Amino acid sequence: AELLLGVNIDHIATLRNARGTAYPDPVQAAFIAEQAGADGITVHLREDRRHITDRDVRILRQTLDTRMNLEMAVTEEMLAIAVETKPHFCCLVPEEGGLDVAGQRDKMRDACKRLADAGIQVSLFIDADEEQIKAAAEVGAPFIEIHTGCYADAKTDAEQAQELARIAKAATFAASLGLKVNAGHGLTYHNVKAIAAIPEMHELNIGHAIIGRAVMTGLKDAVAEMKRLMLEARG
Amino acid sequence: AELLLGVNIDHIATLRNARGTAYPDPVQAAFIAEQAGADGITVHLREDRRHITDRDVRILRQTLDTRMNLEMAVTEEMLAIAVETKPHFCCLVPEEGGLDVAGQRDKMRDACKRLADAGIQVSLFIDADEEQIKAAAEVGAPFIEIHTGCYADAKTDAEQAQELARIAKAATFAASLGLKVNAGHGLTYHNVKAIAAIPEMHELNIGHAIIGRAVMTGLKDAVAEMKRLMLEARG
Amino acid sequence: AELLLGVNIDHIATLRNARGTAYPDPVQAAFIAEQAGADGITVHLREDRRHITDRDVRILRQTLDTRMNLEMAVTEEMLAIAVETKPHFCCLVPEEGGLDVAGQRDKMRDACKRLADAGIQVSLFIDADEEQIKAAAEVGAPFIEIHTGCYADAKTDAEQAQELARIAKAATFAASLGLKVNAGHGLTYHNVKAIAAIPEMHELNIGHAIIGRAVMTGLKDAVAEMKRLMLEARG
Amino acid sequence: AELLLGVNIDHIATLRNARGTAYPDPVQAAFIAEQAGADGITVHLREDRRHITDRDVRILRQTLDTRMNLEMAVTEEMLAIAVETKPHFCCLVPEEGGLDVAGQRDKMRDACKRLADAGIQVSLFIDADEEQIKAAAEVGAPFIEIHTGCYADAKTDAEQAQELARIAKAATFAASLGLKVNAGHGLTYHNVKAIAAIPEMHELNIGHAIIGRAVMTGLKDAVAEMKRLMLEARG
Amino acid sequence: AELLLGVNIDHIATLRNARGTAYPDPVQAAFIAEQAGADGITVHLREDRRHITDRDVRILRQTLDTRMNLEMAVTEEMLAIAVETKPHFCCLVPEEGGLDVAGQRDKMRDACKRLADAGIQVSLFIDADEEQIKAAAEVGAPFIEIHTGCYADAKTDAEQAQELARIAKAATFAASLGLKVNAGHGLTYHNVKAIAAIPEMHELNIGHAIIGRAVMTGLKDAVAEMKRLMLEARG
Amino acid sequence: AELLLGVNIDHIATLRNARGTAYPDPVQAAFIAEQAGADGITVHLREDRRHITDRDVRILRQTLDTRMNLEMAVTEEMLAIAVETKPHFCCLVPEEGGLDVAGQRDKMRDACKRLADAGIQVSLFIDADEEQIKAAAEVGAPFIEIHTGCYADAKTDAEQAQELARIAKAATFAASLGLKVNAGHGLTYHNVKAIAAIPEMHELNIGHAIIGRAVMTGLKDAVAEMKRLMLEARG
Amino acid sequence: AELLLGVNIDHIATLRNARGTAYPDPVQAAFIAEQAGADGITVHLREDRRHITDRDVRILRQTLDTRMNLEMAVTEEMLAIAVETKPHFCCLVPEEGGLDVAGQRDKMRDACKRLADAGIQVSLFIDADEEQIKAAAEVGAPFIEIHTGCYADAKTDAEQAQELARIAKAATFAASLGLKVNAGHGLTYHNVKAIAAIPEMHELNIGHAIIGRAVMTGLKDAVAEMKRLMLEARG
Amino acid sequence: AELLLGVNIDHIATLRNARGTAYPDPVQAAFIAEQAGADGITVHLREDRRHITDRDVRILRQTLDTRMNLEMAVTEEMLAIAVETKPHFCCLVPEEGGLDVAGQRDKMRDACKRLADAGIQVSLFIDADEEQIKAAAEVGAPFIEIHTGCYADAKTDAEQAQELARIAKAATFAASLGLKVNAGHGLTYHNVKAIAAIPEMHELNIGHAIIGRAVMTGLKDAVAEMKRLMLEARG
């Protein structure tokens, strides 16, 4: 299968809420992305509705032509919402910045099972850590998403090749356990290739860099450009 | 003279700071705008550096091909900065949301004179209020900028025509006193024309709506589109 | 202000329901048109829900940046719907081609009354007929939309200039009664100007021609094109 | 190895025949598609001539630069027209949705031979069923077109990888019997790749998704996008 | 009123017959221009069928969305074809270069009357010469098209102003005889305006300069740019 | 190695001389193509100077950024011109359609040697016929260009595969004699790939199909699209 | 009333002559500019032939579709070349920066007459000074080109409205003496309008700003932008 | 990872300093290139500050998103500058064309040492010379950039293939010494591939050709174009 590109449109809302108006609208951004090479759309519903709102999730769930990846923390509230919303994907995150699955095997087991019961495919956001990965496999998540943050912030060309290698070994380890593996968070037009080249990678969920390119060149080209780089890497 | 369009790039930074990276960069946005129909660039330096930073102002002041309109509150800090920076324009604002010039004739007189002494053309941000306008004329500002906020938020087609009329009478009053008059703040692609049609209008400083259009269509077209609407109104 | 353009997006949905999939989606088309020169979006909710659906209207009502013009037949169902939807405009059409206001003064008078209590501004779609126009004015409707179908259909240059004269004359008469007047049905890229040249015209609501240009050229350009011909006509 | 794209322009006609004007014209759509990556144009001449008309087929036959793929039901009327027109291909269709070749070996036997004597390369529109494939081979048709509708409608990932498997097996089966195999019908920008990667696939005939993308982006980019996805799948 | 643009697509066919292929096809050129500024399409059916052919004319007559202007020499053949084809316009040309109406008053008189009974508006392609204009008025032709070749070939800027003047006086003279007047032969992007500013001008029929620009920029912009220059001239 | 594309701009001049103007100018067409995928430019200086003229050749020789391929008949005139012009390449053509080298072994032998001393690489335009290939090898020509006309005219899909095969075997045969081989005459957007996939192909010289596409889309994309199809073929 | 744009392509050559390759070629730049709204092309042939060369002028003279404006100093060499080349215009320049006509009435008297006998329309590059204007009139030159350099360099708004006043008076003065007046030299996208609005202005010759915009956006849009600003100023 | 592209923007400034204005601005060009395929930006700070200035470098150092490659002569001035600027890369060039490392082992050894202490990664620009390569490796430099000038200049196909072989061979040898190798000087759109095909190449730093394409076409496309040819070469 072709590498997939999930586009996170949270920052479209960031720009909206810096002024209370209705624009720009994440609903429009999603149509653009789904038609410029995005295979999925990701929104992070935060408990403080600061940036994405219940409305966005509500309409988005009716307007998306592909599928939603709802990013949320593991709280009673969010789980409740997710089960009602029935997103195709759910990515659990904290409130290096990865979920501490290994340290909460019960809570995560309960969440995965529950979301799974609502027909939601679950992804645990975690660091390139085999303990955490082993833990995720064990609690029942069909997916994990490796935090590419440290890799993006690689101050030195060395720290980077090092970070890349850790992610790669982590992914291969994740797949041997039967997990499908995503990445994203921090990837840019300049560092996406090494990650896209990792064979075990299933989908890359990228947000900020794309929105940052969009204010300059427009969303359509920004999304197309990212996808193209991704497929260049694989070929 | 042709109506002028000043583009406020504050929100380019809003989108930048929602992630600490270097992008998107307001310096790039300014080149794009200055070449797509913007006659001036406006940045608001806030005391909490939340969104635009000293760096932006510093580089921008060297990279702008047209001129800077530095938007700031009337504090010792800001005045200090402005005098050092030597912006071509300075727009004083509060910390309907207009400066209370009438109620602070001394502070404003001191500020205007001081900025004027640094060769800075001053603009007082105020409501469509003849008392405030008379006050501004009297304290020495060569410019005022009428807050178009209430007009943009006109809930009813009636409240709007009403708000438009107040702005228009206010402008004509401002000019009789020898003031040059700007507007902007809240204007959109759908309400810019009635304001652009007001003859006394010198420059419209527009920010949010343009950045909101840009994430969809790119900055170049967003700026060009606004300018075109503006010149359609006048002709 | 300037001549307005309302884009009817009904045919986006007729292309959708020809296959029962979710695309194309009227919600997307509305975003595009509103950002390319449309001042309003028109949807006709048929009783058989042939093309537009209650879903489209529901979402559309929350996503439009400008204003919705609901096109509907005068029936208990539609009135109740219009009342709860609270569209900014409601254009009453038949269940030469226009509504028979003269022959149903009672129905129409109450209809307008009922919609006006819900804040909806009513427009009666009628023929370039002085009797119907006078009747419309008498039932209290604030708007009338003149059916330009025959003008469009005109098979000979003469039959066209004639239908044109008949329309201009009607527009003038309706305005003499305090009626604000629209038109647009059947208008094309090649015949829109003469109509747009009529001074009393407030807004042209066009659909088919635009969507038909769109499949070849894209909605954005199709809309900007029409908008430009219209403003050219008044220049 | 070099996948061909056949664009079905039927829906261009549905949009036109919703108004009774000459636009949009299928003849224009074909020129665009043929120059944007289409290798053939398909038109379905229905009995009720609701969408595509005799005129279309007649001019299309003289304007096409590549070749026509005439979709029709097996009747004396349609068969008569086919032999008259001399389309390069003829795709027999019912008027799982597939054509029943097994249950009519004689009708089909005659149809194919008749069309064959007229120089028409015949293709039988069938379901991914071993029975029908064997029938088509035995009956003498050079081509079969596997119905992908079920694969497109598959609600879940698993129900999809399943339908994909059936099609891939059916294509390999078809090929071993000396049959050339096409598909398309239901393919979209989001599911087309998995079908394109099927080695045996000769040509994918696609319509609805392309025309639906076209009302937003324009026919050329719509057709060009699809062709590009297809070649990437084989690359 | 509106200055119209008729695009002569003859040279598209010229480019075709230089290889006896089907491309480029005039039927396509015609769709492009009609959607990019052309108000009409002109084709010269030469007796030897050098450039345009009978099929061109026949299909064109069914595909044109605006109207056809059939250029032809005066011979029973062409007339019969014309009467048969019922093109909206017929511009009689010779096969200075203008049609000699004075020297053939009888023939033309029959032609005009003849074509006029079929319902075809006739125009006589003539030189900016009074004898020929009076001649065309006497004969009953509703239109004349002034040959702009000598103007287009105007070597010096004086020899050129001579031609302009000569064409302008001739146009006013023609109008004074109840004739409607066109022009267009040899007009280019750099000389069209002076001619378009002539008040009496009803439609400019241009071919060569446009096709010549189109090879570089593409037909769409070549047409749109010419229409744009014309409207600028009359503003 | 890299499959090269030589664009024959003859038909640009064809379009020019159809009016004896200066536009369109081949010198311009040449800049466009060289920057859009052409690795060379080909011009056929016909003895009667029908299409291309001496100035064309003369200026072109000073403006081309890549290299010239002068097509010409074998006569003392052309040779002298060639020897004078020092074009990088010279493709000797007749004035099946291929050059008859067998029947003129002597003449060609002198031509090749003659042009070769001026430092001009020579290529003989011949049919996919062994007698002529052996002939061209014997005579000393370093290149041959296989005429692809019969292939391009391939009415049936069989008559076509016959030509492909015939060209492929001929190319391998030519290579086995130490000859380098080109092709290109009559190749289009829909048939170029099969020819480009032939391993022995060194450069495809194409003209007509490109100019034909360019009238619609503009030269730049016409060239870029052809080069793109070619690289796809060899990948 | 219809302002002409003259594009100076000198800087295209400076960029080339910084490397000693054939690119970028002024010949290409001229084709683009002439088709993007330029009415003439200017080239300054300098003694040191540092930028523009003899070759350029030589080919330019044969490729231009509009006309050449040869900029040169008054010397026997340059004058000799002018008479040989026969440029449409010749703009005499020094090699306030303006040409001293007053202080050399004889040289200029002869130069103009000589160029005049060669058919060259002469223009004297002078400062906005009453003395020089009178001299140019008395000396016999048909044109003068007012140096706008000082107006472009004006540091402050007031110093600018001042220089603008001097130019406008000088142009009206020049016109009353029967002189045709041009400008340009220093104009930019940001100051061009005020100069364009000057009624008397015949042609603005611009170079640097346009080429500087061109390296970012491309020559065509650069030239098209400038022409559009100019016409808006007169509109 | 993949072959990198470094864009030298020196010529943007050479177009600027040809007039002393502020445009075009290298800072803008850098943003464009970095977003169109450039992986690095190269600036050559000459001692005479002919084109690039200390200002450009200072700002550029704060605005680049990727990494700066400072090109400089080995002198006390430049070293101190490089040391305080801390560019990611420093490419040492002369004050065949490359640096004489073999003959200045001491200077070079210390230079590298000094720059490496400031964290700068050093590259020595040298000829495809085994002696210089070996010397470079011995002085401790981590990179070498092979001068491709002669390859570029090659006047004959043979002289080119030869210079090519010489370069490939050198690259291989340098890599055998642990040296990472770049190239790019003089590379064009027509000769870049053969070079990019060399496996050891790490990054191509190209300038003139790109800027020269830019004035015609725009920097963005110029850069994306080059980047695409490069990756095509490695495909």
Side-chain angles (χ1 to χ4, degrees), chain D residues 34-35 38 66 88 121 231, chain F residues 157 190 193 213 216 232:
Chain D
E34 293 192 314
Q35 282 159 54
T66 62
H88 195 95
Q121 293 206 56
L231 302 193
Chain F
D157 312 314
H190 289 88
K193 281 187 170 173
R213 172 67 71 80
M216 311 296 177
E232 278 173 8

Side-chain angles (χ1 to χ4, degrees), chain F residues 1-168 170-235:
Chain F
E2 244 310 47
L3 208 215
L4 305 174
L5 166 69
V7 180
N8 185 309
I9 59 186
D10 283 343
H11 292 3
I12 288 296
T14 290
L15 188 52
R16 178 179 64 184
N17 294 40
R19 191 70 80 198
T21 45
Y23 58 79
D25 195 322
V27 183
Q28 163 168 42
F31 276 112
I32 294 165
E34 291 194 318
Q35 285 156 55
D39 302 288
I41 297 298
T42 297
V43 281
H44 182 176
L45 220 207
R46 298 184 36 160
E47 184 189 1
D48 58 10
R49 293 24 166 52
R50 153 223 116 37
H51 44 45
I52 290 279
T53 74
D54 297 290
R55 79 70 99 150
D56 284 346
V57 174
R58 177 170 45 81
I59 290 167
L60 235 27
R61 186 73 188 68
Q62 301 167 269
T63 54
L64 289 182
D65 185 62
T66 64
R67 28 72 151 179
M68 180 194 299
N69 167 37
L70 214 204
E71 266 188 358
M72 52 180 241
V74 186
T75 79
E76 276 297 332
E77 180 189 348
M78 295 315 317
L79 284 167
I81 291 171
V83 175
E84 170 49 45
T85 297
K86 259 91 189 172
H88 192 88
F89 293 104
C90 263
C91 172
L92 306 184
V93 301
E95 268 177 54
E96 279 191 62
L99 186 59
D100 179 4
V101 178
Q104 316 183 66
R105 292 191 159 75
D106 286 72
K107 184 187 295 174
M108 305 316 193
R109 188 194 318 291
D110 296 74
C112 295
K113 164 56 164 60
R114 176 90 169 281
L115 297 164
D117 306 338
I120 305 177
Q121 292 196 64
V122 177
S123 165
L124 308 191
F125 180 76
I126 60 171
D127 305 307
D129 164 70
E130 285 194 2
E131 178 191 351
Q132 297 293 358
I133 305 176
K134 287 187 286 191
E138 175 247 302
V139 168
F143 276 80
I144 57 155
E145 175 179 318
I146 301 180
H147 190 168
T148 37
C150 291
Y151 159 78
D153 307 334
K155 290 171 292 304
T156 53
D157 312 314
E159 187 194 309
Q160 178 171 33
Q162 244 34 53
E163 294 293 351
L164 221 211
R166 184 183 149 218
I167 298 181
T172 298
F173 178 84
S176 73
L177 267 32
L179 288 166
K180 294 168 180 171
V181 0
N182 291 333
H185 212 274
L187 301 172
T188 75
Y189 290 87
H190 289 88
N191 69 204
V192 59
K193 281 187 170 173
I195 301 299
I198 293 173
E200 296 88 354
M201 285 312 172
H202 177 267
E203 176 168 28
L204 302 198
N205 294 324
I206 310 182
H208 193 236
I210 297 174
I211 313 310
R213 172 67 71 80
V215 247
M216 311 296 177
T217 82
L219 230 208
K220 187 165 65 221
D221 293 342
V223 167
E225 169 93 320
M226 182 63 75
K227 186 59 165 283
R228 184 174 68 69
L229 295 181
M230 292 164 56
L231 297 182
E232 278 173 8
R234 300 263 273 237

Side-chain angles (χ1 to χ4, degrees), chain A residues 1-18:
Chain A
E2 173 219 64
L3 215 203
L4 300 177
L5 194 223
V7 174
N8 181 304
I9 61 186
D10 284 343
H11 289 19
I12 289 295
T14 295
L15 194 42
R16 179 183 59 186
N17 298 22

Side-chain angles (χ1 to χ4, degrees), chain E residues 19 21 40-41 55 82 91 94 134 148 157 167 171 189 195 216:
Chain E
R19 191 70 80 198
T21 45
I41 297 298
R55 79 70 99 150
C91 172
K134 287 187 286 191
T148 37
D157 312 314
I167 298 181
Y189 290 87
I195 301 299
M216 311 296 177

Side-chain angles (χ1 to χ4, degrees), chain G residues 4-12 26 29-44 52 60 64 66-69 71 183 189 203-212 214 219-220 222-224 226-227 230:
Chain G
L4 300 178
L5 197 224
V7 179
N8 180 323
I9 63 179
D10 288 344
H11 291 336
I12 285 296
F31 274 112
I32 295 167
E34 293 192 314
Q35 282 159 54
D39 303 296
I41 291 295
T42 297
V43 280
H44 179 182
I52 296 294
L60 244 19
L64 298 189
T66 62
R67 19 82 153 169
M68 179 178 309
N69 174 36
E71 216 161 57
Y189 289 89
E203 184 179 307
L204 302 183
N205 295 310
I206 314 185
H208 192 249
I210 293 189
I211 304 320
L219 225 220
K220 188 199 303 148
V223 168
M226 190 59 85
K227 186 64 165 292
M230 287 164 58

Side-chain angles (χ1 to χ4, degrees), chain E residues 48-81:
Chain E
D48 58 10
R49 293 24 166 52
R50 153 223 116 37
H51 44 45
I52 290 279
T53 74
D54 297 290
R55 79 70 99 150
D56 284 346
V57 174
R58 177 170 45 81
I59 290 167
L60 235 27
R61 186 73 188 68
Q62 301 167 269
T63 54
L64 289 182
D65 185 62
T66 64
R67 28 72 151 179
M68 180 194 299
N69 167 37
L70 214 204
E71 266 188 358
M72 52 180 241
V74 186
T75 79
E76 276 297 332
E77 180 189 348
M78 295 315 317
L79 284 167
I81 291 171

Side-chain angles (χ1 to χ4, degrees), chain E residues 146-167:
Chain E
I146 301 180
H147 190 168
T148 37
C150 291
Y151 159 78
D153 307 334
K155 290 171 292 304
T156 53
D157 312 314
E159 187 194 309
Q160 178 171 33
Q162 244 34 53
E163 294 293 351
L164 221 211
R166 184 183 149 218
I167 298 181

